[PDB]
Design an enzyme around this catalytic site. Sequence first.
Site, PDB file in Angstrom:
ATOM      1  N   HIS A 152      -0.342 -23.304  -8.055  1.00 16.64           N
ATOM      2  CA  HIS A 152      -0.570 -22.986  -6.800  1.00 16.64           C
ATOM      3  C   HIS A 152      -0.067 -23.930  -5.614  1.00 16.64           C
ATOM      4  CE1 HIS A 152      -3.848 -25.544  -7.848  1.00 16.64           C
ATOM      5  NE2 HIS A 152      -4.578 -25.812  -6.678  1.00 16.64           N
ATOM      6  N   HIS A 211      -1.239 -26.655  -3.564  1.00 11.37           N
ATOM      7  CA  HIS A 211      -2.097 -27.894  -3.250  1.00 11.37           C
ATOM      8  C   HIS A 211      -1.607 -29.121  -3.958  1.00 11.37           C
ATOM      9  CE1 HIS A 211      -6.422 -25.800  -2.688  1.00 11.37           C
ATOM     10  NE2 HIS A 211      -5.635 -25.607  -1.544  1.00 11.37           N
ATOM     11  N   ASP A 257      -2.133 -31.474  -6.068  1.00 11.02           N
ATOM     12  CA  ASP A 257      -2.215 -31.764  -7.170  1.00 11.02           C
ATOM     13  C   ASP A 257      -1.210 -31.040  -8.082  1.00 11.02           C
ATOM     14  OD1 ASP A 257      -3.885 -29.477  -6.679  1.00 11.02           O
ATOM     15  OD2 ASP A 257      -4.920 -30.063  -8.697  1.00 11.02           O
ATOM     16  N   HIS A 276      -9.792 -19.831  -6.593  1.00 13.79           N
ATOM     17  CA  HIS A 276      -9.641 -21.117  -6.226  1.00 13.79           C
ATOM     18  C   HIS A 276      -8.957 -21.152  -4.838  1.00 13.79           C
ATOM     19  CE1 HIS A 276      -9.126 -25.472  -5.818  1.00 13.79           C
ATOM     20  NE2 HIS A 276      -7.939 -25.298  -5.787  1.00 13.79           N
ATOM     21  N   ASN A 334     -12.980 -27.887  -3.586  1.00 14.19           N
ATOM     22  CA  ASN A 334     -12.732 -27.296  -2.300  1.00 14.19           C
ATOM     23  C   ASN A 334     -12.518 -25.719  -2.246  1.00 14.19           C
ATOM     24  OD1 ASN A 334     -11.142 -26.262   0.062  1.00 14.19           O
ATOM     25  ND2 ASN A 334     -10.052 -28.319   0.380  1.00 14.19           N
TER      26      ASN A 334
HETATM   27 ZN    ZN Z   1      -6.271 -26.487  -5.590  1.00 13.96          ZN
END
Ligand code: ZN
EC number: 3.5.2.6
Length: 216
Positions: free
Chosen positions: A75, A77, A79, A138, A169
């Site tokens: 995804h 993000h 991380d 998520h 989040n």
């Molecule tokens: Zn994430």
Amino acid sequence: TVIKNETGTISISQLNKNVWVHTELGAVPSNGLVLNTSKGLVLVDSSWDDKLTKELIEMVEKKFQKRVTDVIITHAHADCIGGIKTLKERGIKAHSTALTAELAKKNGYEEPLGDLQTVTNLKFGNMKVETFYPGKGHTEDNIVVWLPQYNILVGGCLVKSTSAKDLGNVADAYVNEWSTSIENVLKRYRNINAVVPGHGEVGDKGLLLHTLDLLK
Ligand SMILES: [Zn+2]
């Protein structure tokens, strides 16, 4: 068997013969996989940024004396896609769905390939890998990774760990659909052995049920 960098911000532990889990501290830990194949190293997700990502790559390449050839971005993000610039300059292919690619660009990151379809099967040497887009959860673009030879599922951040009581989040999340998406993973893979959460210790299918519980 767990190897670490002097600092401790990067560790790599073996799940079995050719599958290892890599964890980096940003102090928030983040998991990903390192696949040792006959044709090079394949990672599932990079790290928080280019410094950690480069250091992670250097660590595994030195240990296995091979090059990292591909990376699967679960995804958009930090991380997971944080070290995209590092991957592209090392000739490492950053696989991702088209959606993840357009969300990465929208978030100030360089673009991954955007090649993965809803169900994509990749084989690196003798290592089989399947990527699956279960729907929004998520994040809008989150996907899971399945290793059919080990029945190991990388739930990424769609799956919370055993002691986690917080979903994380949810500003970019689709809380109401998250549950349906986990059900699609559960209906798709009937015999799961281990599942790697996005953050936390490796567990089993009980982690998906736990996450469904948190979502109630
Ligand atoms: Zn994430």
